[PDB]
A paper describes a structure:
The PPARδ-LBD–pemafibrate cocrystals, similar to the PPARα-LBD–pemafibrate cocrystals (reprinted from Kamata et al.), were obtained without using coactivators, whereas the PPARγ-LBD–pemafibrate cocrystals were obtained only using SRC1, suggesting that its physical interaction with PPARγ-LBD is the weakest. The electron density of pemafibrate in PPARδ/γ-LBD indicated a single molecule in the protein monomer similar to that observed in PPARα-LBD. Their overall structures were identical to the active conformations that form the AF-2 helix 12 (arrowheads in Figure 6A,E,I), with RMS distances of 0.75 Å (234 common Cα positions in PPARα/δ) and 0.71 Å (226 common Cα positions in PPARα/γ). Pemafibrate was located at the almost identical Y-shaped structures comprising the Center and Arm II/III regions in all PPARs although its phenoxyalkyl group seemed to be pushed toward helix 5 in PPARδ-LBD and its 2-aminobenzoxazole group seemed to be pushed toward helix 3 in PPARγ-LBD. Hydrogen bonds between PPARα T279 and water molecules were also observed in PPARα, whereas a water-mediated hydrogen bond or electrostatic interaction with 2-aminobenzoxazole group of pemafibrate was observed in PPARδ-LBD. Pemafibrate was further stabilized by hydrophobic interactions in all PPARs. In PPARδ-LBD, bezafibrate was located at the Center/Arm II regions, where the potent PPARδ-selective agonists such as GW501516 and GW0742 bind, and only pemafibrate was located at the Arm III region as in PPARα-LBD. The concentrations at which pemafibrate (known as a selective PPAR modulator α “SPPARMα”) activated PPARα were three orders lower (107% efficacy and 1.40 nM EC50) than those at which it activated PPARδ (11.3% efficacy and 1.39 µM EC50) or PPARγ (119% efficacy and EC50 > 5 µM). Pemafibrate activated PPARα/δ/γ-LBD-mediated transactivation, PGC1α/SRC1 recruitment, increases in thermostability, and bound to PPARα/δ/γ-LBD with the similar Y-shaped forms, although it acted at much lower concentrations on PPARα-LBD than on PPARδ/γ-LBD.
Residue numbers in the entry: 173 to 204, 208 to 228, 234 to 441
Amino acid sequence: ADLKAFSKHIYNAYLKNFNMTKKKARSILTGKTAPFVIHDIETLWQAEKGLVWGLPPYKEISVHVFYRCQCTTVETVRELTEFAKSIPSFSSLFLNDQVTLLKYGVHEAIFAMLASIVNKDGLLVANGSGFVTREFLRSLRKPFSDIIEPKFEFAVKFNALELDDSDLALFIAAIILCGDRPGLMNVPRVEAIQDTILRALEFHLQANHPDAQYLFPKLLQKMADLRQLVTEHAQMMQRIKKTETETSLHPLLQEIYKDMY
Ligand SMILES: CC[C@@H](Oc1cccc(CN(CCCOc2ccc(OC)cc2)c2nc3ccccc3o2)c1)C(=O)O
Ligand SMILES: CCCCCCCCO[C@@H]1O[C@H](CO)[C@@H](O)[C@H](O)[C@H]1O
């Protein structure tokens, strides 16, 4: 009862704050308008010249994709921040504790939600109006071609669990409310909120996925998988900042990756 309403509150905060939902994504990816496919240089250009679509000064094809990728991340961080403010008691934390949770949590949540817009062949872009192929991303020059590929591997496995948006709302909330983030001041308070979230998640999963047996423990493992995925992503990003000294890294991403792990 308490948990059912708590889950509903989180769900509505999710629907309120995220422009792209899995319901919308799967509808686009299954055909019910069709996205413009971006599979090489020429189609990427066509996607820029109206159709589908501010950025740093143009450098090259691979850096351009890198820049558009960052812009989308920054926008999703804005959404996750507003979503977190609706998680009961998150706003009661001191401001720097809120930032600490978002700093170490947003990319874990981003990569979880990324699975919603992905299939084995590519992912939606531009609010679902475009589709960039996995192959085209593989064809970019290193190191940029190695950024997104490992996320496809996680996403395909994650999509096998067949979560819906109501499940994901609680899942993302549990990711953000994480008591072991470095520098967190009020660990007991954050652990207490997370426990409420996780209890609501188990209650919600058995009501929404009755025939799903080990779904809750599987999602706990997914949370651990996302932390290592992000650790390896932070390494790549920290490397690229050192290697690609002429490519711009958005200030928000610089701050997120600042001595992270
Ligand atoms: C770069 C540094 C960046 O790493 C990454 C690595 C992998 C994935 C992301 C986040 N992401 C980008 C998808 C593709 O992004 C494009 C965009 C345009 C394009 O070609 C024109 C090709 C790829 C995303 N979208 C979402 C939509 C809904 C929900 C969650 C979403 O998560 C960031 C970081 O560290 O933040
Ligand atoms: C309060 C606003 C936060 C941004 C402050 C400075 C923004 C500097 O410029 C940023 O560089 C990024 C590099 O990819 C671009 O992608 C961004 O679109 C651009 O705004």
